[PDB]
């Protein structure tokens, strides 16, 4: 019935294991670069949240074969996270009660025009190859990593733009409350490229005045932040029943204490207040102790920032908490972005900070109720809540707490 | 606690909705044609399993803006769900108890390609335009339906290949179980395009040998099939909890009485016994009702087609229900197949039939001692099964069972 976080792992633009994400949390360090690729691509937006790592052999051959970007992160943080929970080969694989739920936003657009491209060519079929299926597929990140791994419990993706991960996150939860595994691998992976890219700076969702000074172009609730920085990467976490992690010794993070998965019903791409509200609420229900740390959606974008941080203000009113938006030194890597937030929130209970929300020149005057965090403050925290509000009006919050 | 199917909808091969579908069952009609596109672009395969109607002016474009052919596909199968179920928006519009959980196996290949090529020519991101995230996100589906629907429950996609829309169903189920939701509209959707289907023929996976007669291609069980007949189109059904329901004196199909998942964790792409006979027997525990009627993945491939009967087999033994494999008269449509075959089998329990497994010019010898029916055949049915095994080793099984 109860679910705990007992080993995490991750490969993001700000660090490659969980101990140079830290540091980096710590320092406020934007893992924000220029990107040579988006400008040749003829997008405005040539700001990246890229991963710092040639995954190029990282994986055995045979195995990558099937994997795209979004599949090699997130099977590169899996095996971290098997690490970190201290599991034995034959404490997961093939194991009925042991399943997987990853996701990505997006799948393999590079591969989906890969295969396209191909088949218009000289070479038609043969130019295309039998791996584009599982590399382009939907469900390309929990197909390439239950195969390897041995997972014989749930498999599967679930996918909510900017939410995915954090959906797969609250759905491993339920799986434990519902007593139908013991352990669920959650969490989701995200290439980046232009092919995917373009598609959002053509909705002008992407910043695109500050390619000179890219650090400075993710600043969420900056009075003149102008959208957010695509990014990339993976993230992964084992979720686990307590009793489970209890009996076998295992290092406890914090117990999912809350999770709540609203609809806006309103708005395409646009976020209504009401549906973040409920969400929160939701995820609230049940819980007691109060939220100590915020990790915001807030993904740099002049209504979405605004309209969250509203949203705070009814489910808190005055007892509003410390709020801090990583995405300012992270930026947006879509699918991967709500498991690797709660890893951030998890890293920053287990070493009692607060990460800095960076790039604040001038806060955005509907800010005013603050608690927004602009310097890294050591506290003791306890209890720390995750907002994820993708594209279609999905929304997701995560509540974890210390046991 | 239960959950039960109170209403259904369909757009696909072999017919328009219930009412035409529940014809080309009876008469055992294919779905199958031959396709210009598809020849035309090179592939091997030139059959297809397309859905016989003009959409044009059947979505406000205000909302079919944002849409692909599989969001549009599953819209046009809600709109027959919510008014085949007796609801009406009053009842399931902004109201926190009412879901969405839908998705498809490919999400939009033909607009995540077209962004691509758009990009690339002169106009550049004028030529993307800003819908194509919606239409080639891989929670598409989901997203363009909550949105107009006014959906405030959960709202998100789940994928997995052939499994998609099946584990789309079972989770919905959950939130029933879980007292979180008291409708959830579960279903799922997938456009045909030579885009995704390249990528298909590519692995070998499609029929390439009854080009000249489309619907002879499809022939599962038949000792001569050579791959399965990519397909595309919608479903959706009404997964609600029984207390509401009865209350509303809604009109009641069935009763989801068994719901399995599990992954093979062993081979990409090739199915592994194992993992699909524990998927069924997870699906029958508790179920006291013996299998009447199974409609099987059977896709009409070499390999896994008998892989399941012989996981039948280990499952039943000498309690071997009557199969079927629809897939023979409609194809594989990915994505929706999951929901479509739900609909199928929900519909012969209804109307007291069993489909037949149509095109075995031939019986493979692997499919010795059972009961495959080949004709139309009128039975009193109570309990229902529908298997769904997708690549990636992912499986999901159904049971639905008369009240």
Same mark, same amino acid.
């Not at 890219?214 to 900056?222: F, L």
């Not at 998965?261 to 395409?268: E, L, N, R, V």
């Given at each position: ?193 232009? #092919? ?46 307590? #009793? ?160």
């Amino acid at each position: 019935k109860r679910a705990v976080i007992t080993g995490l792992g991750i490969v993001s633009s700000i660090g490659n294991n969980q101990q140079e994400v830290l540091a980096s949390l710590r320092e406020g360090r934007s893992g924000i670069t220029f990107s040579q690729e988006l400008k040749d691509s003829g997008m405005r937006s040539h700001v990246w949240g890229n991963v710092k790592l040639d995954t190029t052999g990282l994986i055995d051959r045979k195995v990558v074969r099937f994997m795209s970007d979004a599949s090699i992160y997130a099977f590169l943080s899996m095996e971290q996270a098997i690490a970190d929970a201290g599991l034995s080969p034959e404490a997961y694989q093939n194991n009925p009660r042991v399943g997987l739920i990853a996701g990505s936003g997006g799948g393999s657009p590079r591969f989906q025009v890969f295969g396209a491209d191909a088949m218009r060519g000289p070479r038609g079929l043969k130019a295309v190859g039998p791996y584009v299926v599982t590399k382009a597929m939907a469900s390309g990140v929990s197909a390439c990593l239950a195969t390897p791994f041995k997972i014989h419990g749930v498999n599967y993706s679930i996918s909510s733009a900017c939410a995915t991960s954090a959906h797969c996150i609250g759905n491993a939860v339920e799986q434990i409350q519902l007593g139908k595994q013991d352990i669920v691998f959650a969490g989701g992976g995200e290439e980046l490229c232009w #092919e995917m890219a373009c598609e959002f700076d053509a909705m002008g969702a992407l910043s695109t005045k500050y390619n000179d000074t890219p650090e400075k172009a993710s600043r969420t609730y900056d009075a003149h932040r102008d959208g957010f920085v695509i990014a990339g990467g993976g993230g992964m976490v084992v979720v686990e029943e307590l #009793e489970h992690a209890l009996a076998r010794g295992a290092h406890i993070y914090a117990e999912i204490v809350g999770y709540g998965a609203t609809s806006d019903g309103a708005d395409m791409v646009a976020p209504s207040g009401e549906g973040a509200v409920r969400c929160m609420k939701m995820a609230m229900h049940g819980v007691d102790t109060p939220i100590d740390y915020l990790n915001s959606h807030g993904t740099s974008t002049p209504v979405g920032d605004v309209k969250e941080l509203a949203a705070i203000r009814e489910v808190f009113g005055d007892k509003s908490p410390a709020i801090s938006a990583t995405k300012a030194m992270t930026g947006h890597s879509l699918g991967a972005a709500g498991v690797q937030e709660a890893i951030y929130s998890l890293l920053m209970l287990e070493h009692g900070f607060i990460a800095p929300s960076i790039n604040i020149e001038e806060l955005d005057e509907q800010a005013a109720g603050l608690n927004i965090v602009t310097e890294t403050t050591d506290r003791e925290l306890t209890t720390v809540m995750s907002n994820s509000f993708g594209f279609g009006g999905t929304n997701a919050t995560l509540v974890m707490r210390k046991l």
